[model samples]
Target: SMLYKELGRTGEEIPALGLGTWGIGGFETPDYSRDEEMVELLKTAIKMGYTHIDTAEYYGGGHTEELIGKAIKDFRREDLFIVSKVWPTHLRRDDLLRSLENTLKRLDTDYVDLYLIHWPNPEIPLEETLSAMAEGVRQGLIRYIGVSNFDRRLLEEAISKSQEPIVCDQVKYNIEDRDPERDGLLEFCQKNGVTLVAYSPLRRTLLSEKTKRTLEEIAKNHGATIYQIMLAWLLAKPNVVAIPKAGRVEHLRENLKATEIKLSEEEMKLLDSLG
Candidate 1:
């Protein structure tokens, strides 16, 4: 079974690994050609134990949610935990509510497990957006609330203003990219009992030679892939979860097995320095 942990202080035990559906149907536009393939991948991922699906209304211009809606029909609704986001452009109460309604329409679902603000708006008040989210929960449109790309200060600000518990702060987290830690959001989440959901947990740019060497050495000893080692390092942290985008079933399977790979305390320390 996949490893499970409390989503913040919510007491909801969600899988540590989830499917990041950013490029599934498309990035900014719907790729009709890959729709069938991405839909199949989502179905296969769920079959392989991916119930924590992370998506956004802006993803594929909401085509990602449509793909999720299509992929979930064969599975039990109660078996899945769908997460979607409202873009920064929609932070206004009315816009947020409308965006969520359309998100549900696209997903063909009544309620989303977690609805996050994709990015904080400098022009908009945090309380305004959160109040709208509270309305979502009150109406059964959302089960929980979260924020993405928020720095430590912003996360605390939102937490203070939210009527519902701000369950998580989703950000880009990886061995090479540790924005959350650099900004102290990771520490804040850990200390305050908030989940830090990592998007872009996979590497895109090159890693420092030293960190790469350590990861390689650890991977060799553990008989695991470097990516798995990277994941294990993050999973070792309390209140941390990841949503890595996988376009293929092989990648998804490999990503899932990351939950099973264990790292030594020393290895964790080594990675702690690497990031």
Candidate 2:
């Protein structure tokens, strides 16, 4: 089984190999159907040790959260880690709380493990939106507060202004996009004990072929695959977690095994050079 990591300052120990529900919830295709096999796949993931499940409100118009709610309804709530994001447009309207209420109904729960502001809107004052989030925290709608797709300046401001500690900042982090490192967000979070949740950790499969060759060369020396090496690189980062989307059960199982693929310090340095 894969080990777990502390979710920032929260006392929650979540599995690193989280299930991203974007594609799985019917966003990937227009004609996708919800069936026993899909529910079975999620159950299999839980049985295989995936505790963290990430979803968003705009993802297939809440279909993802609805499906996840039904799929995991039988499991112990304490045994799972759930995350959901609030859309930007809803942040400014009276619909924010209404939207969250709808999300809760779909998720079939009273409170989420973590609730995040999906993105920043320059037109809306951060104070107003964050104040609303603080209210959510008070109302017990969410356990912890977090942000996604936020820059360093805005992230720090939100952390400073939030009534509850901002536990995480989800970003588009992959081999191709290192904006977190370039903008001081990584170091900022490191100093503040905030986790960096990498969403596009696989670079949406761009790093597959290119890094496959590199992994092939290294695997010849270490007996692993390019995919495992790439995943290991993300796992090796302190206070960082990755959520990679996989459609097939076999692919999910293979990705979970990445926890055991340890890359040497020198190999890590080489991978860093590529990034």
Candidate 3:
């Protein structure tokens, strides 16, 4: 069975394993060269039972959202949990709202499941950005408010200030990157009913040979793939959801299967040693 987790205190449940769209088309620029392939990948994931889809306005200069719009047209919209992020540059009240409108337009949806602040901007008052987000919630444009790459301090203030519920805090978390713990976000999320969405679950660069062997050894214990081991280790934490980018169907299936891996106490101990 697929593992599902509740969203903060909202009581809304979504699959803990979701799809990421960081470089589906391009990282920061539009790339339609692979539109057909990307769209197919998205539809395949949805068909394979991935209900949560994460995207951002900056991804592929909005091309990724457009592609998602095209791919999701046939599916029952209510069955999908769609999320998008607004950049910090548009933190101003008007700019943030307008940018959200643009995001909806590109996404071909009236309201997104969750609207996130891509990053915190000290230059702009957090109140200003969240107030605009409140407006989005008021207008029924944003179903929920969330933040990405925010620390415990910012997340705390956001929860206190946002007129809407602060449901999620997305960040880079994995076996190698333990910033979430060092920053105390994991504990805060668990305590305050916030969902910590883990992006970049897989380390970007190559791991040392020793660490690879360690992972390989653990994977053999569970008869799981390396990617499955990485995801299982992260999912083992409370109040955490992971959105790993999988452009290929093979990786997508493997990602979904990772949810089934129940790591033993010893395996958990070994994996935690890598952190």
- Can you rank all candidates by lDDT, best first? 3, 1, 2
For model 3, the local distance difference test gives 0.90
Q: What would the per-residue lDDT of candidate 3 be over residues 108-153, giving only the tens digit for each residue?
A: 9999999999999999999889999999999999899999999999
Deviating ranges (above 4 Å) for candidate 1: none
Candidate 1: residue 246 Cα off by (Å):
1.8
Alpha carbon lDDT at 194, candidate 1: 92
Q: Which residue pairs collide, candidate 3?
A: none
The model with the greater lDDT, 1 or 3, is 3
| Clashing pairs for predicted structure model 2, backbone only | none
Q: For model 1, how does the per-residue alpha-carbon lDDT over 15-121 read when each residue is reduced to its tens digit?
A: 89878888778899887788788788889899988989999999998899999999999899888999999989999999999999999999999999999999888
TM-score against truth, every candidate: 0.97, 0.93, 0.97
Span of 10 residues, lowest total lDDT, candidate 2: 28-37
Candidate 3 deviates by what RMSD? 1.2
Please write out the lDDT profile of model 2 over residues 20-111, one tens digit for every residue.
87766678332247556677788888788887888888776777777788788879987888899888888863667777788889889988
In model 3, how large is the Cα lDDT of residue 23?
93
Name the weakest run of 10 consecutive residues (lDDT summed) in model 3: 202-211
